[PDB]
Enzyme design. Sequence first.
Site, PDB file in Angstrom:
ATOM      1  N   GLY D  44       0.822  -1.221   0.000  1.00  0.00           N
ATOM      2  CA  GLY D  44       0.000   0.000   0.000  1.00  0.00           C
ATOM      3  C   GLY D  44       0.846   1.256   0.000  1.00  0.00           C
ATOM      4  O   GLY D  44       2.029   1.173   0.385  1.00  0.00           O
ATOM      5  N   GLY D  47       0.641   6.190   4.358  1.00  0.00           N
ATOM      6  CA  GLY D  47      -0.503   6.731   5.119  1.00  0.00           C
ATOM      7  C   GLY D  47      -1.694   5.787   5.127  1.00  0.00           C
ATOM      8  O   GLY D  47      -2.654   6.040   5.891  1.00  0.00           O
ATOM      9  N   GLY D  49      -1.757   3.274   6.547  1.00  0.00           N
ATOM     10  CA  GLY D  49      -1.681   2.755   7.925  1.00  0.00           C
ATOM     11  C   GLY D  49      -1.525   1.243   7.920  1.00  0.00           C
ATOM     12  O   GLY D  49      -2.311   0.548   8.598  1.00  0.00           O
ATOM     13  N   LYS D  50      -0.582   0.751   7.127  1.00  0.00           N
ATOM     14  CA  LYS D  50      -0.245  -0.694   7.032  1.00  0.00           C
ATOM     15  C   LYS D  50       0.162  -1.181   8.419  1.00  0.00           C
ATOM     16  O   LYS D  50      -0.206  -2.320   8.779  1.00  0.00           O
ATOM     17  CB  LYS D  50       0.893  -0.938   6.034  1.00  0.00           C
ATOM     18  CG  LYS D  50       0.479  -1.115   4.577  1.00  0.00           C
ATOM     19  CD  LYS D  50       1.508  -0.589   3.611  1.00  0.00           C
ATOM     20  CE  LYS D  50       1.584   0.921   3.633  1.00  0.00           C
ATOM     21  NZ  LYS D  50       2.820   1.419   2.983  1.00  0.00           N
ATOM     22  N   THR D  51       0.878  -0.319   9.152  1.00  0.00           N
ATOM     23  CA  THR D  51       1.316  -0.525  10.562  1.00  0.00           C
ATOM     24  C   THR D  51       0.090  -0.721  11.461  1.00  0.00           C
ATOM     25  O   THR D  51       0.062  -1.714  12.204  1.00  0.00           O
ATOM     26  CB  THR D  51       2.145   0.660  11.055  1.00  0.00           C
ATOM     27  OG1 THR D  51       2.906   1.165   9.964  1.00  0.00           O
ATOM     28  CG2 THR D  51       3.058   0.269  12.185  1.00  0.00           C
ATOM     29  N   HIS D 233     -11.178   9.207 -18.015  1.00  0.00           N
ATOM     30  CA  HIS D 233      -9.981   8.322 -18.213  1.00  0.00           C
ATOM     31  C   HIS D 233     -10.371   6.894 -17.813  1.00  0.00           C
ATOM     32  O   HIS D 233     -10.185   5.983 -18.643  1.00  0.00           O
ATOM     33  CB  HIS D 233      -8.693   8.797 -17.501  1.00  0.00           C
ATOM     34  CG  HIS D 233      -7.439   7.987 -17.745  1.00  0.00           C
ATOM     35  ND1 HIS D 233      -6.445   8.391 -18.613  1.00  0.00           N
ATOM     36  CD2 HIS D 233      -6.935   6.881 -17.134  1.00  0.00           C
ATOM     37  CE1 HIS D 233      -5.441   7.534 -18.585  1.00  0.00           C
ATOM     38  NE2 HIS D 233      -5.710   6.597 -17.692  1.00  0.00           N
ATOM     39  N   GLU D 234     -10.955   6.725 -16.622  1.00  0.00           N
ATOM     40  CA  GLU D 234     -11.263   5.387 -16.032  1.00  0.00           C
ATOM     41  C   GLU D 234     -12.502   4.786 -16.702  1.00  0.00           C
ATOM     42  O   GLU D 234     -12.503   3.545 -16.892  1.00  0.00           O
ATOM     43  CB  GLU D 234     -11.423   5.479 -14.511  1.00  0.00           C
ATOM     44  CG  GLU D 234     -10.239   6.143 -13.819  1.00  0.00           C
ATOM     45  CD  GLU D 234      -8.854   5.616 -14.166  1.00  0.00           C
ATOM     46  OE1 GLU D 234      -8.714   4.392 -14.357  1.00  0.00           O
ATOM     47  OE2 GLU D 234      -7.918   6.444 -14.238  1.00  0.00           O
ATOM     48  N   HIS D 237     -11.283   3.438 -20.152  1.00  0.00           N
ATOM     49  CA  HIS D 237     -10.496   2.215 -19.834  1.00  0.00           C
ATOM     50  C   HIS D 237     -11.481   1.042 -19.649  1.00  0.00           C
ATOM     51  O   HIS D 237     -11.433   0.111 -20.452  1.00  0.00           O
ATOM     52  CB  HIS D 237      -9.572   2.430 -18.603  1.00  0.00           C
ATOM     53  CG  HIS D 237      -8.314   3.226 -18.816  1.00  0.00           C
ATOM     54  ND1 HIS D 237      -7.467   3.052 -19.899  1.00  0.00           N
ATOM     55  CD2 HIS D 237      -7.712   4.152 -18.035  1.00  0.00           C
ATOM     56  CE1 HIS D 237      -6.428   3.859 -19.803  1.00  0.00           C
ATOM     57  NE2 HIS D 237      -6.550   4.544 -18.653  1.00  0.00           N
ATOM     58  N   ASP D 291      -0.385   5.062 -19.710  1.00  0.00           N
ATOM     59  CA  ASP D 291      -1.359   4.405 -20.624  1.00  0.00           C
ATOM     60  C   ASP D 291      -0.691   4.315 -22.024  1.00  0.00           C
ATOM     61  O   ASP D 291      -0.662   3.184 -22.584  1.00  0.00           O
ATOM     62  CB  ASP D 291      -2.754   5.078 -20.579  1.00  0.00           C
ATOM     63  CG  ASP D 291      -3.418   5.334 -19.217  1.00  0.00           C
ATOM     64  OD1 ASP D 291      -3.089   6.375 -18.602  1.00  0.00           O
ATOM     65  OD2 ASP D 291      -4.323   4.548 -18.808  1.00  0.00           O
TER      66      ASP D 291
HETATM   67  N1  LIG Z   1      -7.666   3.164   9.175  1.00  0.00           N
HETATM   68  C1  LIG Z   1      -7.014   4.322   9.229  1.00  0.00           C
HETATM   69  N2  LIG Z   1      -7.695   5.473   9.186  1.00  0.00           N
HETATM   70  C2  LIG Z   1      -7.030   6.628   9.238  1.00  0.00           C
HETATM   71  N3  LIG Z   1      -5.727   6.863   9.316  1.00  0.00           N
HETATM   72  C3  LIG Z   1      -5.078   5.717   9.363  1.00  0.00           C
HETATM   73  C4  LIG Z   1      -5.599   4.432   9.330  1.00  0.00           C
HETATM   74  N4  LIG Z   1      -4.612   3.492   9.406  1.00  0.00           N
HETATM   75  C5  LIG Z   1      -3.521   4.207   9.552  1.00  0.00           C
HETATM   76  N5  LIG Z   1      -3.712   5.548   9.466  1.00  0.00           N
HETATM   77  C6  LIG Z   1      -2.701   6.589   9.498  1.00  0.00           C
HETATM   78  O1  LIG Z   1      -1.617   6.144   8.715  1.00  0.00           O
HETATM   79  C7  LIG Z   1      -0.381   6.686   9.237  1.00  0.00           C
HETATM   80  C8  LIG Z   1       0.638   5.585   9.355  1.00  0.00           C
HETATM   81  O2  LIG Z   1       0.662   4.815   8.143  1.00  0.00           O
HETATM   82  P1  LIG Z   1       1.465   3.446   8.298  1.00  0.00           P
HETATM   83  O3  LIG Z   1       0.683   2.537   9.170  1.00  0.00           O
HETATM   84  O4  LIG Z   1       2.837   3.707   8.814  1.00  0.00           O
HETATM   85  O5  LIG Z   1       1.527   2.963   6.774  1.00  0.00           O
HETATM   86  P2  LIG Z   1       2.721   3.368   5.780  1.00  0.00           P
HETATM   87  O6  LIG Z   1       3.656   2.177   5.828  1.00  0.00           O
HETATM   88  O7  LIG Z   1       2.070   3.603   4.459  1.00  0.00           O
HETATM   89  O8  LIG Z   1       3.362   4.621   6.279  1.00  0.00           O
HETATM   90  C9  LIG Z   1      -0.737   7.374  10.563  1.00  0.00           C
HETATM   91  O9  LIG Z   1      -0.667   8.790  10.490  1.00  0.00           O
HETATM   92  C10 LIG Z   1      -2.147   6.876  10.884  1.00  0.00           C
HETATM   93  O10 LIG Z   1      -2.935   7.866  11.505  1.00  0.00           O
HETATM   94 ZN   LIG Z   2      -4.683   5.386 -16.396  1.00  0.00          ZN
END
Ligand SMILES: Nc1ncnc2c1ncn2[C@@H]1O[C@H](COP(=O)(O)OP(=O)(O)O)[C@@H](O)[C@H]1O
Ligand SMILES: [Zn+2]
Lengths: 368, 374, 366, 368, 367
Positions: D44, D47, D49-51, D233-234, D237, D291
């Site tokens: 992903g 932001g 929020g993979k963490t 565009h989409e 496609h 594209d």
């Molecule tokens: N479900 C969610 N809704 C809103 N913000 C989220 C969510 N999950 C994570 N975040 C935000 O994502 C940020 C951290 O992203 P992270 O987990 O580190 O993924 P990445 O590896 O892309 O940085 C934080 O600022 C957190 O507030």
């Molecule tokens: Zn495209």
Amino acid sequence: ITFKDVAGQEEVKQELREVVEFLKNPKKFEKIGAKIPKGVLLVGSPGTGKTLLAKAVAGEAGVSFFHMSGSDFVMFVGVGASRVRDLFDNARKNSPCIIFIDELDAVHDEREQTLNQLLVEMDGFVIVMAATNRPDVLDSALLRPGRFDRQVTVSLPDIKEREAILNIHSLKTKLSKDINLQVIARATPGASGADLANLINEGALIAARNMEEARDKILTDRQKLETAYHEAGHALLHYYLEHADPLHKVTIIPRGSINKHQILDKIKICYGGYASEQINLGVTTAGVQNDLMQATSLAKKMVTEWGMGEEVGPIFLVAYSENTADKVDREVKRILEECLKEASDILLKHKDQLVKLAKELVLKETLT
Amino acid sequence: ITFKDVAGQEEVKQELREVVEFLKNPKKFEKIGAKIPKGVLLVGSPGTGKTLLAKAVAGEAGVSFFHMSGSDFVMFVGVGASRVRDLFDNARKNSPCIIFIDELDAVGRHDEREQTLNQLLVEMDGFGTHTNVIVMAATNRPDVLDSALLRPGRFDRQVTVSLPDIKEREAILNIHSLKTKLSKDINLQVIARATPGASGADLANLINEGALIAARNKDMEEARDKILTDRQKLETAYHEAGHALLHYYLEHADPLHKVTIISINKHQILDKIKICYGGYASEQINLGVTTAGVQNDLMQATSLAKKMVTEWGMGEEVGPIFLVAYSENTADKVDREVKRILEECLKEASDILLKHKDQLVKLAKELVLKETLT
Amino acid sequence: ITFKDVAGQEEVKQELREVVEFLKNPKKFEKIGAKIPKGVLLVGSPGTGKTLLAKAVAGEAGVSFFHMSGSDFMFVGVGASRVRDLFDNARKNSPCIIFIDELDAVGHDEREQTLNQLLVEMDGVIVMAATNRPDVLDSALLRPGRFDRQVTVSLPDIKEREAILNIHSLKTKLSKDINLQVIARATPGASGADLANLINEGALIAARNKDMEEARDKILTDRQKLETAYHEAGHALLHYYLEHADPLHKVTIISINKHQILDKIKICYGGYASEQINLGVTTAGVQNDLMQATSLAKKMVTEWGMGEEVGPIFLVAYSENTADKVDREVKRILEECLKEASDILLKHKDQLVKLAKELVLKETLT
Amino acid sequence: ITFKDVAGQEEVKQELREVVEFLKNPKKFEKIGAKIPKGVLLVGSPGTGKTLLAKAVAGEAGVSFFHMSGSDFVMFVGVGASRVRDLFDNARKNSPCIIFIDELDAVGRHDEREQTLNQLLVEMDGVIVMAATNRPDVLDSALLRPGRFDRQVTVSLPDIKEREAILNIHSLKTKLSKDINLQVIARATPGASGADLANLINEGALIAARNKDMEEARDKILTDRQKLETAYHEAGHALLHYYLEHADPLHKVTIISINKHQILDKIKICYGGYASEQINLGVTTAGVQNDLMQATSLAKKMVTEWGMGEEVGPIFLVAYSENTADKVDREVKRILEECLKEASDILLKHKDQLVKLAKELVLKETLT
Amino acid sequence: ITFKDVAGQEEVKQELREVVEFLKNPKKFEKIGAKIPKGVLLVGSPGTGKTLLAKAVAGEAGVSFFHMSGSDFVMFVGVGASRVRDLFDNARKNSPCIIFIDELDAVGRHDEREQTLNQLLVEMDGVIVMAATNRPDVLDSALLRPGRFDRQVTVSLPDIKEREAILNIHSLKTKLSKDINLQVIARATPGASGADLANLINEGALIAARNKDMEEARDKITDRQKLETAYHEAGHALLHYYLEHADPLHKVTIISINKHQILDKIKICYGGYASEQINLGVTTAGVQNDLMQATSLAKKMVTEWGMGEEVGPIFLVAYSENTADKVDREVKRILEECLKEASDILLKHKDQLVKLAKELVLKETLT
Ligand SMILES: Nc1ncnc2c1ncn2[C@@H]1O[C@H](COP(=O)(O)OP(=O)(O)O)[C@@H](O)[C@H]1O
Ligand SMILES: [Zn+2]
Ligand SMILES: Nc1ncnc2c1ncn2[C@@H]1O[C@H](COP(=O)(O)OP(=O)(O)O)[C@@H](O)[C@H]1O
Ligand SMILES: Nc1ncnc2c1ncn2[C@@H]1O[C@H](COP(=O)(O)OP(=O)(O)O)[C@@H](O)[C@H]1O
Ligand SMILES: Nc1ncnc2c1ncn2[C@@H]1O[C@H](COP(=O)(O)OP(=O)(O)O)[C@@H](O)[C@H]1O
Ligand SMILES: Nc1ncnc2c1ncn2[C@@H]1O[C@H](COP(=O)(O)OP(=O)(O)O)[C@@H](O)[C@H]1O
Ligand SMILES: [Zn+2]
Ligand SMILES: [Zn+2]
Ligand SMILES: [Zn+2]
């Protein structure tokens, strides 16, 4: 060792004496308050025994000798520089001493600071002697005042030096009066001091198993004339061309602000071997390569860099249109073809004078 | 071991004797005050048993043998050089001794190797001292070697080992045969010719493969196949026939010392190019088709051709100009003159071989017979 | 492990036996004075379980097993130390087997001397090695004694596939409702591990609640088998009809004369042809087939001097005019060889269409 | 934390459950004799929020959580590998535990990382490792092999619904009057990240220090029409997938061994959005680049590598004559210009159907 | 130091206050449960005294100041990272503290810096860090992420007013007779840096000790060239109003895109090229970047974006010479079409352009 162990160095010998004379009695040079050269560089092909002369210098001076090769100093980190300092420290202890630095070319990487160290001890204020087969590889700093400011050139032995050399290593063996060294001397033109020395050995070795047989383990009297023509043609043109200077010497022993008018005469003299090669043998040799290459470079420089090109114009072309390219290649061809003509013509007239030098060269191998 | 353990080396054998003779009675050479060669280099393809001969030299001389590979010395920092010195120190202790340096190419040219080799240089440069230690070296790729290695004293002697001929092959099979059970049913002369230009070890491995095939229960035939014609021997015979035959007829050539199936004038240059095309011709003259084995023959011809035009100024049209980027017009000139010079030299060659075709077809079969001749 | 843990390799199995038999009773080979191979190399794609066979060899021989990966063998000499170290301890457990997975990794840098050490130690216990990419390997590795033996491991056929599924099936509770022969063909040219993972994926899918079908999809056509059958049919069929070719040892859906070179180029164009003759369209799977053809073509013209127009010149740089000559002669030589091929396959189309369906069935034949 | 702390994850949530379920009751998986996946990779943009999800997995499973970044291990020599083992050693002590390896790209591609990863791979082969990569194609194939990161879960930028939902969660952490509508901001910020939104709140709360403030914050981060532009565009496609025989309909449409006939249909689809932009807005955008690039690549491959070119022939071209070049460039132009036509034509007929998706996308933002 | 020690920062000053205000009374921001920015980046040319403002921020906040340069941390292996940790450890001890990281570019670009940076990032994620970069586009994206240098403040070369003001401050540090007027020197040194001016005084003060001396120092470095510049910038800015797909420039100083949008830019890029001719009849060399950017956009239209009529919907970025000639010519078409719409527009409103010029020679900056 002695200068008597070296042959055909005469001029080089006298050149090295001023060093010998220094090491013995520095006071005479200290009298008038004259700084002595710290560094003296010997330039020559392999087997010219640049090492031999360095020893002999110390010998004739009865001075300490410290042999160090560039391969040795050139070590993890600073170890080489330590060896540099270390050598010079112990060398200072046996003052007046001579340090010999074989393959100075050897001393980027740790070498940089090793070199820096080499330069350091030199300017520190013992005479450093160095030997390079490839001198153009050397950093300019090495040749600056004090540090290797003196330079002496060692030439492959001529016929006379060759015979003389054979005689010295001959004494180291039991050679019957049946073998003539003058016969082998000419048989081996442009051979090295060591090459000849090894020939004797090879023979001496062949004997004990049971010098002509040894010649064959090197794995034409006509080809000597072929070479004589390349060099004859080159040298002869210097007298007849206004903007040239007569050659200091003419040899068949391998040597392994300019006006348009000056540039062009050079190009002509480069073609003086492609010339006499046909004028005399009707065929060209491959030995013209460097002669052609140098001519072509000068030609290209006239056109591209120096703006001496009639068609191409006063432009610096040293990525351009193919049309612009064809212009250069064409003006280069002209300038060269002209210079070859002026050369072929000049030699055709004085052909009798050129054919004179040829055989004289096949005889004396060298003259001025 | 003995020189009797080696086959098809007779010339090489006699060449190595002068070394053997030294190690035995150095005084004879010390008598006239003659320095002995410190270094002797054996050049040859893999399996030519360059190692075998080195041992046998010591054997015939009853001398100590110290095998060391270039791969070994070639180490952290100075460790290799230490190993070099170390070896030579202990080697001096067993004087007269022989040191064998397999894959000299490995240490032969910077890096650690540089000082490692610089070391070999100092170690072997011994000194005026007799020392009575002779270094023997084996290189599959000798042109990789630094010039320093070949200088007087240090590897100043060079001896070339050739892939075994039919006679040497059969002889070789017989030696390793004794090491196993050879039923009188297997004829080694049959296999000898069956395996032209095979290596001493290749043959030796065939026996082994058979001996292994036996223990699973003629059988040596099944082993031949586990390496995974008589016509192709003539094909090769034609490439080499064409090459060699031209040397006699061309003025500026020198006759080949041997023919096997295992400052130069324009006139000299051109004859070479013709000889290069030789086998290309006999290949059609005889088989009507060309092989791929011309590649290097063509490449070398084309190089000489290009050199004539570009560097040596031996080109009629191109002129006495050094062309080593230029106009496309200038390019087409070179490509065209090169094509001519080559196409000419091929003709002169194809023509000559067509006349003496009967003489060329003679060599073919004679080659399929003697495999090599003078 | 056992050779019973490995499936569909009888030939490879019997090839490895001679090694097993050595380790057990070296004396019989020592009797006649026959040197035993010190090195044996296994060549195969990932999941062919090259490792599995190596273990089994020791297993059937009840011999010590020392697994070492090329990735393992490091600062300076450390790898070489590990090489020596391994061989020292390995000599202690003789007869022992050393397995060197990814021999490509150690076969520039420390690897050089690590390899040198590998070579060094072997020259001094049977070493077994596995390489997915064998052309990367230094020729030295293959010299007599050192990896002198080479055994090739093939992706499992339909029979080996079903057989393999059965072995890992025992490790799970798979209802008799799921047929492995159905999945075997469903997964052509899948790897031993690929199949093994499918079972697991299913077994995992079960615990969340036949299910093996859902697992197939978590890998995230019976017609395409014919498409492949045509590429390979076209390739193989030409070997019989072309004089200067040699018939293919096998056909699966997994010193050279001008006349020999050209027949190859024709064979290369085999599958390109058959695709059109049968499907009327060409696939992208011709790429390597086209590339190899084109290489030979270029070599004929440029290096081998087998070009009519270009001549006996080595062009391997030159004028654009000289270039156009090469590109044009190359196009001809190729376009010719395609024709000779397209024509041959058109005549014997019935014979080619025979192999196609037979291939969709037997997957491999000789 | 909880899966209730994550919003718009539903599908991802259910995807992660199978992991959660393992950590809780491994016996159920040990029952049928099923080996458990050791590695699960979350892919992903930043932001997403993979963490967050990784923590929540452990949360719902009440399992130990060990966060480790690729940047950490990536450490002089072997230090990082030791850190790898050290983590895994202590991690095995808190089993069942989850290890999170953020920026797996950092350790997943020359030296330390080679051994470092070897170690990462080594340890995994031996506790479920979870990893997050923004750039997954940079990762060595070895990472994805069976057992090691064999599972992969993709996290998408939040949709309008997920956006509003997300704003609500961080809103609770502050004093946001019911006057501010999060649905208004949700659409106002299309394709914004979980953190981007969360930061907007913060920036607003920071602005409140002065005491419709969230609007001032939007500007301090330094179009409803551009949503239709993207929609076109989409739309273009996706619409083509149904009408083209050799295509497969798109799994979803959002505003956040192949036959010639298959290859060509792709090229047409690549030209989809390029077309629609003209059909609808009469102008083309720059967003066609990739594209166009992909279309052109396939085209080049047809001609050069696959021998699918009429004029060029069954030749492998990947240095050749300029004449040969012009052939390729021209055949490529044709193949493309054709596929664009077939595309432009199709979209012209069903323009009303395409214009339907446009606003529907500007509304639902995503569809199947 | 004080914000009173800094001149012509007004807007920047107010921008930095929100930081000052945080360090003083963090509770106000902690009240609503609002996370405070950990990082604030100052972007500006050399001599803009980015360092000066950072100190003053701490000053007005009565907070501890820890200056650290990127050159320092950028060390054997992990040594710099240890220095990073050490700094932040001691910095945490003097909290609320400000850390200044001059030349953040030095640690922001793998190597030791990578883990040093990682450490920098690591520590920040855990005191407000302030950083100064002359070259910000060199910086890793990670540096600008939420929390870490999420705030960015731009520092401008001093205008005529700020220049005179600046001269007055360093003047007090020397003995400057009321005969020398700083407004005279202010305009004499347009687009000079805070330190450049400060050094002028010094140079004079040095010249004095050998004994209208500040004039000799001027020379130890044209009022007409101010109009030349005024024309390049006049032409650029004026086009923004008249072109539909442009947005007017926020200010004019002498210190997913549609084809229609792309093209207007190219015209604007040609503004100064035009005005130089329309007014001075000759073109200057200062067009280089203006031409380069135009040409890039042009090339992109043709090669990558498929916006070329002749060249077609093809991605060209190794092709035939014939294909090349097509590109080089579509470009000269678009480019000359653009310069035209521009050259004309400026010709009509020339009177409006000549106005901006003089106003620029006077105000040096305008909106
Ligand atoms: N479900 C969610 N809704 C809103 N913000 C989220 C969510 N999950 C994570 N975040 C935000 O994502 C940020 C951290 O992203 P992270 O987990 O580190 O993924 P990445 O590896 O892309 O940085 C934080 O600022 C957190 O507030
Ligand atoms: Zn495209
Ligand atoms: N005057 C000389 N006559 C004959 N041989 C000589 C002479 N000087 C040196 N040599 C030979 O040169 C070899 C050494 O050359 P050296 O002094 O090392 O110069 P280089 O640096 O070119 O190798 C020895 O074999 C020695 O016999
Ligand atoms: N005269 C010989 N006849 C047969 N085999 C030989 C002979 N000499 C050596 N070999 C074989 O050559 C192999 C070793 O070759 P080696 O001496 O190492 O040369 P290389 O350096 O080319 O490898 C051995 O397998 C040995 O049996
Ligand atoms: N005969 C076999 N049948 C089924 N799977 C096999 C077999 N041999 C090995 N495997 C599988 O292959 C994988 C290991 O392959 P490996 O032995 O490491 O070879 P490689 O070197 O190609 O990776 C394992 O998942 C194992 O289950
Ligand atoms: N407001 C100001 N007025 C005048 N000079 C200033 C001002 N701010 C800083 N300077 C000068 O700028 C120089 C230092 O610039 P600095 O703060 O290090 O920024 P940079 O990072 O661009 O070098 C000093 O010589 C100082 O006198
Ligand atoms: Zn040949
Ligand atoms: Zn195929
Ligand atoms: Zn500008």
